[PDB]
Amino acid sequence: SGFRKMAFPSGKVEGCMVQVTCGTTTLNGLWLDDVVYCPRHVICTSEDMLNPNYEDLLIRKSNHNFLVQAGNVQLRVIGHSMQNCVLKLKVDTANPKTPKYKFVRIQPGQTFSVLACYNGSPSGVYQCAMRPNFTIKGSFLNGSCGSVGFNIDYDCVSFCYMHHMELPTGVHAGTDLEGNFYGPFVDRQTAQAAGTDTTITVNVLAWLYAAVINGDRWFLNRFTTTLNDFNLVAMKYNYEPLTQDHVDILGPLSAQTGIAVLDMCASLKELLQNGMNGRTILGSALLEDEFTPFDVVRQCSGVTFQ
Amino acid sequence: SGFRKMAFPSGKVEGCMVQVTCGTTTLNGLWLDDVVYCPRHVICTSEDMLNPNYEDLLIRKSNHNFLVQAGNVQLRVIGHSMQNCVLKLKVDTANPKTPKYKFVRIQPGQTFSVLACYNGSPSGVYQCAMRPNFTIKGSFLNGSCGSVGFNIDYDCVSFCYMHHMELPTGVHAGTDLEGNFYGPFVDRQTAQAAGTDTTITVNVLAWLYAAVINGDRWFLNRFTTTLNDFNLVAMKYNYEPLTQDHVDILGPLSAQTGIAVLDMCASLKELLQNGMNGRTILGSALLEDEFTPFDVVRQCSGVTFQ
Ligand SMILES: *[C@H](O)[C@H](C[C@@H]1CCNC1=O)NC(=O)[C@H](CC(C)C)NC(=O)OCc1ccccc1
Numbered sequence: 001s002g003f004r005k006m007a008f009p010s011g012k013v014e015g016c017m018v019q020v021t022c023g024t025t026t027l028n029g030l031w032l033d034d035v036v037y038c039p040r041h042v043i044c045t046s047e048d049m050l051n052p053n054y055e056d057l058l059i060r061k062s063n064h065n066f067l068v069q070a071g072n073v074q075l076r077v078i079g080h081s082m083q084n085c086v087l088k089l090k091v092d093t094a095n096p097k098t099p100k101y102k103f104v105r106i107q108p109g110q111t112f113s114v115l116a117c118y119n120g121s122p123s124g125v126y127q128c129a130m131r132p133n134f135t136i137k138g139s140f141l142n143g144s145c146g147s148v149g150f151n152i153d154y155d156c157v158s159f160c161y162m163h164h165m166e167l168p169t170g171v172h173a174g175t176d177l178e179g180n181f182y183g184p185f186v187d188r189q190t191a192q193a194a195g196t197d198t199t200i201t202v203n204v205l206a207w208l209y210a211a212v213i214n215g216d217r218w219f220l221n222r223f224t225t226t227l228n229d230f231n232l233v234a235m236k237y238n239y240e241p242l243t244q245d246h247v248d249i250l251g252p253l254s255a256q257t258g259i260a261v262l263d264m265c266a267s268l269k270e271l272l273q274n275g276m277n278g279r280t281i282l283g284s285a286l287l288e289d290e291f292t293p294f295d296v297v298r299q300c301s302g303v304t305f306q
Numbered sequence: 307s308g309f310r311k312m313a314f315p316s317g318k319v320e321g322c323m324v325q326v327t328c329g330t331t332t333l334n335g336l337w338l339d340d341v342v343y344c345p346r347h348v349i350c351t352s353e354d355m356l357n358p359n360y361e362d363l364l365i366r367k368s369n370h371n372f373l374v375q376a377g378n379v380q381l382r383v384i385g386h387s388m389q390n391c392v393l394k395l396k397v398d399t400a401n402p403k404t405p406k407y408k409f410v411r412i413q414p415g416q417t418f419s420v421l422a423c424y425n426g427s428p429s430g431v432y433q434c435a436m437r438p439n440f441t442i443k444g445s446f447l448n449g450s451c452g453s454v455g456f457n458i459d460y461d462c463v464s465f466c467y468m469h470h471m472e473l474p475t476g477v478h479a480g481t482d483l484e485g486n487f488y489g490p491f492v493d494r495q496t497a498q499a500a501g502t503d504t505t506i507t508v509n510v511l512a513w514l515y516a517a518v519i520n521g522d523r524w525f526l527n528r529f530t531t532t533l534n535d536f537n538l539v540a541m542k543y544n545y546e547p548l549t550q551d552h553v554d555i556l557g558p559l560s561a562q563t564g565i566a567v568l569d570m571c572a573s574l575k576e577l578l579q580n581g582m583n584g585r586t587i588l589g590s591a592l593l594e595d596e597f598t599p600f601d602v603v604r605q606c607s608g609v610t611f612q
């Protein structure tokens with residue numbers, strides 16, 4: 001037993017990280033088949049980035065201005081192009097270590113693993129949630145751009161995120177691998193505005209279910225509640241509204257625990273109005289919202305990939 | 307910026323996980339060169355495990371009773387032997403994906419990444435600390451035995467932990483890869499006693515330094531303290547005593563922040579006596595102690611492996 005924030009095994013993605021250089025900017029790219037993907041601001045200098053005209057900047061570049069390195073061996077750029085905020089470099093060699101993969105645009109509230117990279121070299125892996133306001137709470141330094149977020153189902157790697165920028169708020173913003181930002185963000189060095197962040201209610205419930213599965217059962221109470229009775233309390237506390245579709249997603253967890261979902265909502269309601277009184281749940285003094293119901297079921301049994 | 311609990315990239319270790327079967331028990335083994343390492347209780351039935359005579363149980367086994375599988379391909383056992391609580395299976399083929407590696411016995415307070423495995427197949431990765439009482443707070447289900455904990459320096463994998471058992475307390479116990487348990491534990495299914503756990507003071511300070519590096523600076527105060535003045539407060543709160551060698555380990559973090567270490571101890575003293583007053587530090591309502599000073603410096607800049 002036990003419950004930990006768990007990332008996917010990163011081996012399949014490690015083999016796809018390369019270094020992309022152009023000017024003095026170096027960052028990470030993703031090498032799949034004969035195409036390298038990286039953030040398009042690799043083509044900016046430090047002055048460009050305040051309001052870059054990316055089309056005019058890319059025009060001044062040719063294939064040989066793009067140095068791509070995988071370890072110490074290397075590809076040549078036989079073509080380049082811009083798709084939204086990513087650059088695609090067509091290269092000599094198809095990556096021999098290309099995993100089965102898809103590109104997916106994930107939804108707010110879903111989680112993924114981030115392989116943090118510097119100079120094309122993997123550095124660490126951790127789990128993140130796409131916040132309701134389309135930011136992530138990451139760990140990214142200069143050079144980290146082009147690090148990717150992914151899920152593994154099967155032997156199949158679903159890439160969902162490429163890192164581009166840190167907002168002066170301290171949280172992080174990026175694109176899908178077609179180069180479209182999550183959220184309202186643009187790739188320029190300007191003060192940019194994330195919305196109010198809300199707590200992912202269905203994730204908090206799933207973690208309360210994980211807590212019961214693991215012996216933490218004190219918060220379980222006497223009360224019950226209705227869906228709209230709870231949703232009134234949810235908006236008081238900036239929790240995203242709970243729907244019937246959320247209830248049904250929790251069905252498996254409800255059936256393994258024998259605790260009805262709105263029995264679980266009633267415990268959550270009192271935690272929100274009464275606090276935790278200095279006690280803890282799965283070793284945390286806060287309500288955790290970065291576990292999806294699938295994360296919980298995975299970890300609590302299943303938990304197996306090619 | 308930002309600060310997250312980060313595991314090492316797991317690719318090098320994924321290639322070493324195999325399935326070891328003997329009877330109906332299946333668990334994970336580690337395949338390095340032509341030797342497979344796994345917990346010796348793979349040779350027990352469900353009745354043996356209450357007080358197994360491992361030597362007498364191993365004698366009834368021969369090489370062909372040990373089914374070792376790496377993916378779907380497979381090795382033959384040309385020799386077996388017991389070293390402390392691990393079985394070593396000499397096998398046909400040297401693992402083509404063997405990384406450069408060493409076996410190390412880590413010290414209390416150090417951290418490592420755990421690659422959780424089931425049926426020889428990697429499932430997830432997360433970071434753990436060896437507690438002062440030689441347990442870890444893990445996430446392990448049935449079948450997880452033989453999963454390993456490791457560090458990466460270089461391209462060099464330092465294996466330090468193999469998982470064996472869950473204590474009725476809920477925390478986890480295991481051996482080094484020479485088969486010697488961390489702590490007083492034995493591999494039998496008996497109620498077993500971990501000591502009082504203490505908080506790793508030097509790790510908490512390192513995380514407070516990480517907090518200051520990342521903008522969380524409210525806890526920084528006015529006071530100072532002496533080493534033994536702090537150590538009196540530390541034993542009140544079951545914190546391990548702070549020594550001069552701990553101070554010097556924190557030197558780098560002190561010099562990047564400009565905050566003297568016993569200036570940092572004074573802030574920690576007031577957190578311990580006054581609580582956090584419902585505020586948070588790096589998004590946590592508790593004092594975190596599973597980051598070493600090296601973890602902090604790694605993540606806060608460096609953070610790069612083969
Ligand atoms: C790409 O490597 C970099 C990632 C930033 C670096 C600091 N923390 C991150 O997540 N992205 C940028 O530098 C980005 C470039 C624009 C053209 C998109 N600008 C940016 O994110 O400004 C925020 C910032 C810059 C430098 C240090 C701290 C924050």
Ligand SMILES: *[C@H](O)[C@H](C[C@@H]1CCNC1=O)NC(=O)[C@H](CC(C)C)NC(=O)OCc1ccccc1
Pocket residue numbers: 001333347350355446447448449450451452470471472473474478492493494495
């Ligand atoms: C090895 O796969 C297994 C790992 C346990 C399984 C449950 N959570 C774990 O960490 N180890 C054992 O089953 C161990 C065998 C002895 C001969 C060492 N016995 C044990 O740990 O008992 C505790 C336990 C057993 C089953 C479920 C929950 C706890």
